[PDB]
Amino acid sequence: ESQPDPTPDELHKSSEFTGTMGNMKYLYDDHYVSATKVMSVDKFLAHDLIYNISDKKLKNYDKVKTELLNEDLAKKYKDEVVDVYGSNYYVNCYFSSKDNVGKVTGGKTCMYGGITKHEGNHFDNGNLQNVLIRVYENKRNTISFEVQTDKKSVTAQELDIKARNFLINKKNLYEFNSSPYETGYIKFIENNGNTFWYDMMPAPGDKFDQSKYLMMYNDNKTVDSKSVKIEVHLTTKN
Ligand SMILES: [Zn+2]
């Protein structure tokens, strides 16, 4: 059911990552795909969905492929009108898409999960929900800040992205060469008592695989924005 807290020895240490921390920072520093009321237009593999989504800013892509945990999830959202929000990558992003006139199999950008039904998923009076993030540095709550979302059921991915974007800016969570923190995990606590956490640091070694890291979001896990509680736990060292 609930996921047990990290054992001391299982959390990734920034000390053991000899690659460039900027590759991790890239995924969260004002970086995300956002789309409203779209419907998939194609598939590549059985568990993914392809959408016609182009970025106004920079014009880096016109097609987005999102991979889900399995075929049932893909099937569930295939013909649904959804909203999209997630962290995209280009390295090792593959797909032969159903490209309209202007393009030919436009394999532009990739991501995982990040899908929520549009209909009935928004607050009345067009209000935004504020979600509080409490951050602990070396076991002490140093700061707390709020992120906002207009979705009632929001992906954990969306809140994680917003939380890290703020921390990168205010706490230098990730820098180009390294990070001022040794370990770090973001923990979600749901209203029914269920808990889960994501390790915020890259796996040991000299290489960082963006697609491998973001794959954790393929479960398309959603939480109730009005009741979730989020805690960021960081230890200093680096
Ligand atoms: Zn919507």
User: What CATH number does residue 44 fall under?
Assistant: 2.40.50.110
**Number of Cβ atoms within 10 Å of the Cβ of 79:** 9
Query: The tokens 């006139």 sit on which residue?
Result: 101
What resolution in angstroms does the PDB record give?
2.0
- CA-based nearest residue to 52, from 102, 93, 99: 99
Q: Are residues 51 and 74 in the same domain?
A: yes
- CA-based nearest residue to 67, from 210, 198, 215: 215
Strand positions, DSSP E, 19-114: 33-38, 48-51, 64-67, 82-86, 109-112
* 3-class SS of residue 121: coil
Max Cα–Cα distance, the chain, nearest Å: 56
User: How far, in Å, is the centroid of ligand 1 from the Cα of 174?
Assistant: 31
Number of domains in the chain: 2
Answer left, alpha or beta for residue 45, where phi above 0 means left and psi between -120 and 50 means alpha.
Answer: beta
Q: Are residues 200 and 170 in the same domain?
A: yes
User: How far, in Å, is the centroid of ligand 1 from the Cα of 121?
Assistant: 7
User: How far, in Å, is the centroid of ligand 1 from the Cα of 4?
Assistant: 33
**CA angle, 186 then 144 then 154, to 5°:** 55
Q: Are residues 114 and 148 in the same domain?
A: no
Query: What residues are neighbours of ligand 1 (ion), with CB under 5 Å?
Result: 83, 118
- CA-based nearest residue to 155, from 219, 203, 71: 219
126 — phi, psi (to 5°)? 55, 35
Please report, in range form, the residues annotated as the binding site for Zn(2+). 9, 47, 71, 80, 83, 118-119, 122
Boundary (domain end) residue, out of 74, 103, 119: 119
Q: How was this structure determined?
A: X-ray
Which residue segment(s) compose the domain that 18 sits in? Answer: 1-31+120-237
Our separate counts of H helices and E strands in the chain read: 4, 13
- CA-based nearest residue to 111, from 94, 95, 87: 87
Print burial letters for 49-68: b (CB count within 10 Å at least 16), e (below 16): bbbbbbbeeeeebbbbbbbb
Q: Are residues 176 and 191 in the same domain?
A: yes
Beta bridge partners of 185: 199, 233
Boundary (domain end) residue, out of 74, 95, 119: 119
Beta bridge partners of 51: 64
**Number of Cβ atoms within 10 Å of the Cβ of 125:** 4
Contact 44, 92 (CB under 8 A): no
DSSP code of 14? G
User: How far, in Å, is the centroid of ligand 1 from the Cα of 181?
Assistant: 36
- CA-based nearest residue to 202, from 6, 3, 8, 25: 25
Q: Are residues 95 and 212 in the same domain?
A: no
Task: Provide the token pair at 156.
Answer: 């954990």
Helices (H), 50-135: 71-77
Boundary (domain end) residue, out of 79, 95, 119: 119
- CA-based nearest residue to 68, from 112, 107, 35, 33: 112
Task: Provide the token pair at 182.
Answer: 């040794």
- Which residues lie below 8 Å from residue 169, measured CB to CB, with a gap of 6+? 29
CA 76 to chain centre: 20
* Dist. CA 215–CA 210, nearest whole Å: 9
